Design a protein around this ligand. Sequence first.
Ligand code: ZN
Ligand code: ZN
Lengths: 399, 402
Amino acid sequence: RDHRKIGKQLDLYHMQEEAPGMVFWHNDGWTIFRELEVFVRSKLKEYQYQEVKGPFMMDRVLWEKTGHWDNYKDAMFTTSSENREYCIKPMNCPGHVQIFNQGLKSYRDLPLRMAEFGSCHRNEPSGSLHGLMRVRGFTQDDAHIFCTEEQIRDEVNGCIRLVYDMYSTFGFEKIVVKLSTRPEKRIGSDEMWDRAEADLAVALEENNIPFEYQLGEGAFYSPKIEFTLYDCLDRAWQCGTVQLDFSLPSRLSASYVGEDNERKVPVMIHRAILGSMERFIGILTEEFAGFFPTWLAPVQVVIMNITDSQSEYVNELTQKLSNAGIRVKADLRNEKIGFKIREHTLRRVPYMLVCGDKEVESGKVAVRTRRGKDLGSMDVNEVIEKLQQEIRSRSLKQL
Amino acid sequence: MRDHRKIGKQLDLYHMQEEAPGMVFWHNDGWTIFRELEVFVRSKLKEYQYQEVKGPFMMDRVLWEKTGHWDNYKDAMFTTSSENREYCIKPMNCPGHVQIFNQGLKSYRDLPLRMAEFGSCHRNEPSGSLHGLMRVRGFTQDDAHIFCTEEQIRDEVNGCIRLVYDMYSTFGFEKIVVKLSTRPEKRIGSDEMWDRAEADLAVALEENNIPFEYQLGEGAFYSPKIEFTLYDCLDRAWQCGTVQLDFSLPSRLSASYVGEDNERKVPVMIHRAILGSMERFIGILTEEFAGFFPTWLAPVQVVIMNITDSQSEYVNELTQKLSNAGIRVKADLRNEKIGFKIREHTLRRVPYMLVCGDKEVESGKVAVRTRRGKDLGSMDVNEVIEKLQQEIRSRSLKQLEE
Ligand SMILES: [Zn+2]
Ligand SMILES: [Zn+2]
């Protein structure tokens, strides 16, 4: 259950000293990454989020006004062009404010939910790097909600609902929640921190969530709710975060026109559900021990022939399943069928289809799984419908 | 209005600012177009059997020195440092894909290996040369690299050629001009390899019955390239496609495989990009259609509007129905006159506008109007959905009844 070892055996990714802390996503690993993005986007549509994309580097002055430069200077990569210094972004917060600052906003535009799969870079110490868990370049399922003070409770409730909704899809039902309060170095008045901390605590209470206080562990600009999931080995993984931010939009000149026709500074809610998506893939790899659920499996079906007599039949089946939306590969190599089956079983391919002369004449296919279960000969259309149901429902296990 | 910068502002597609010169802030509507382009390209990757990978953003400068890229492009490269090591923000995807290739032992059975990526590239272009979406500092390329044997060159180059005309025809580009860019004066690689690479590219164009002209000295410093230029509706030339035959870089990056004769060989590498910079291609499409993006690319495909509050419930029901059908649909329930709403969404170039009166509510129908000012009359909602889905799935250039 080491994600580094499983990642190598399944050819998911690799890392090398020429790019410390940054991941080379191979075809099979990138397929898992993209399927996670599809799942998140399905939630972005359901929870009514916009999706945007920000530039990778911006002027260092942007990070000076937020206070991040004074506080996280050592952790940020910098580059220069024409006597101007730019920072490769470690977070998506200022970039989303820049998009919000384009075009005059009114209260009718709020709540404005802005999500992004933003890849961030942090100059972490090289000795602290570890596989997919602690990296230098990563992608977060980030989002920022611009809202009024009256809309804080509903929007924080939506973020909390989304956390439990997404975690349950992967089978994580044991979740421990902590609330981080003001640190010893911060921005924003005590009243603002008093209201922000109280709002987060009330939201947890109103959602029937018990929590502990992490005193002084909040960000320098906002308190945060931190969600920790527990894997099948009862190991704790802090993944989700919700921040109630009353300071950064003001420092970035964000404003909207209220119903009173008065200029107001919007409330910003930061949230990420999965956290670093590279890290989440590593957690899933160890949770499933490489046996990814069918909807996440890089290759869902492999169809093999026994002899060259079934080569045409396998190709027709592969196209049919491919057109049905199934990630399917044909294995027509000159090897024993038992050699082909073992190769794909070790790759944890959920379903393996074998076509002999009996299958060709009958129009059926023999089905076995990576767990060694023999499902016998099944109708081709029945196999497709079963696969589609397992994929579209994102079922954890085979039916 | 045909300038993509003006249309982009009117349609709220993107914005740029001096805090990040030559780098695009993609708004929701603009990012939707970008993602639809990604979905289209990925459909071709599936059809043409490409892998899709993702490389790191920065790599050791010593890796860019090995290919000669540092000596040629160092003034155009962004550099950053960490722990007394200097890193280059990648301006191209070639070395990263070779690094993926070099992982694990490769044999002839693994070739051809087609490796694609939507690679985010950055180049330190002069600020005076930047212009909208056409000339930027940060961009994404629909790049791919094919690792193959010498015997596989002709079929793999032919596949790249076919993909170029396949993808351009989807957007309505049928006037294509082809150039073969030969070796530049400042160059790496042997004379014999350059002769073979240039001859192979020329023969591949001959087999596809494609007339072309040579472009002396315009090839890359390591390989020649076929350059494809498309012509827009104003007969303006846009160089987008590129196919490179490369015998130099894989050797310099220690790429190798075990041949059928059980001896180590250096694979051939074919570089190709169809659209080129996808930000630039979006700008070209924006000007080509003058904001009238085809329905499959339109950020908002359908807008449903009421006349009074009596149809507010019916409009909301249909918006949910169309959204569940996979159609990007928005409801317009503001207290404005219906002509005011239609004019506003026509200026947003929304393909279809659905008007629901009380006669529409009882009949379960919708009054269909288009951004071209055409009245299509009342139609059944399910019939509307069926035709819209067919228009989107076929990526049709034309709307209903035109
Ligand atoms: Zn944030
Ligand atoms: Zn290349």
